Design a protein around this ligand. Structure first.
Ligand SMILES: O=C(O)/C=C/c1ccc(O)cc1
Length: 325
């Protein structure tokens, strides 16, 4: 069957640490006072939760309350443990408290407040310098969680909270985050469609932190080319076809051959034959000021089929693209 794969960085961070750090199931949750928080307005609902803008009435400070919908016991424990392990880390959303919601009866996570400006209005405004700056801020969060044995698995614009006025950035929603264990097979049903790495799209289960780097490359390509999303698939199968019309089919077949992966036969009548496109093909008069040889070289090293051949978050911070910043 498929050839096994290992991360080329932070491979053994979890195996050396004690069981308490990564075994979230055995984690004991130290509850806080639900009454300390007063719900002001609903900010959004999600697939697994409802997010509220709130006020901690002890210190009169704005907070964010994330009330978890009844989904699974294990997922909830995992999110708490990952947030507690990454608390204080560069650009990681700070878990201020864990209270039990009186209505829902499920736990409600309390976070610090970040004055985010809508990505739809923010992506249409970023300068070349800002893309670089914010990309470097995301990279700090990605290298920190990866160094700590954690892969986010849901990197997208909506999971990046930007206080553009204070030039603050937070990587949020660690609900899909998982502990990396070498050789462990994971669920390919992670991340949002447009940011799904080819490993997810081909059903390759032995993936790692490099999955976050492909997702970051998708975000980069959307920002520098002013094309939202960059790879616009109608479904999970058309998603792979979208990647293939840019990266080519030969490198896709080379990748599936390397890991001895069997592609779903449904791809035979839709995948076609595609040559790899040169990046300057997506450059035009409305995005050219955001594009540079450094931007294209950096993007080219993120958007690789082979999860093993992608830049790691630390190498990505070393890129000439970040010299200006
Ligand atoms: O961790 C999370 O899922 C949510 C954190 C968050 C913080 C500020 C917001 O405006 C929205 C969500």
């Amino acid at each position: 069957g498929p050839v096994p794969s290992r991360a080329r960085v932070y491979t053994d961070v979890n195996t050396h640490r004690p069981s308490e750090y990564w075994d979230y199931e055995s984690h004991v949750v130290e509850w806080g006072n639900q009454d300390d928080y007063q719900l002001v307005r609903k900010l959004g609902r999600g697939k697994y939760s409802e997010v509220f803008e709130a006020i901690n009435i002890t210190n009169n400070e704005k907070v964010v309350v994330k009330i978890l919908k009844p989904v699974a016991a294990a997922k909830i424990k995992r999110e708490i443990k990952i947030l507690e392990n990454l608390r204080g880390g560069p650009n990681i959303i700070t878990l201020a408290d864990i209270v039990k919601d009186p209505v829902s009866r499920t736990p409600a996570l309390v976070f610090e407040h970040v004055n985010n400006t809508d990505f739809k209005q923010l992506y249409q405004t970023l300068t070349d310098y800002d893309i670089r700056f914010y990309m470097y801020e995301i990279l700090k969060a990605l290298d920190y969680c990866h160094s700590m044995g954690i892969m986010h698995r849901d990197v997208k614009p909506h999971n990046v909270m930007i206080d553009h006025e204070h030039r603050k950035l937070r990587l949020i929603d660690w609900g899909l985050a998982e502990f990396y264990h070498p050789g462990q097979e994971y669920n390919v049903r992670v991340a949002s469609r447009y940011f799904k790495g080819p490993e997810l799209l081909v059903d390759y289960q032995m993936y790692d932190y490099s999955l976050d780097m492909w997702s970051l490359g998708c975000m980069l390509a959307s920002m520098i080319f002013r094309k939202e999303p960059f790879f616009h698939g109608h479904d999970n199968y058309d998603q792979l076809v979208r990647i293939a019309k840019v990266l080519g089919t030969e490198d896709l077949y080379d990748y599936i051959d390397k890991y001895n992966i069997e592609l779903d036969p449904r791809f035979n009548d839709i995948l076609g034959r595609h040559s790899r496109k040169r990046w300057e093909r997506f450059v035009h008069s409305e995005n050219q000021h955001l594009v540079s040889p450094e931007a294209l070289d950096f993007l080219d090293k993120l958007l690789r089929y082979d999860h093993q051949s992608r830049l790691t978050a630390r190498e990505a911070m070393e890129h000439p693209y970040f010299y200006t910043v």
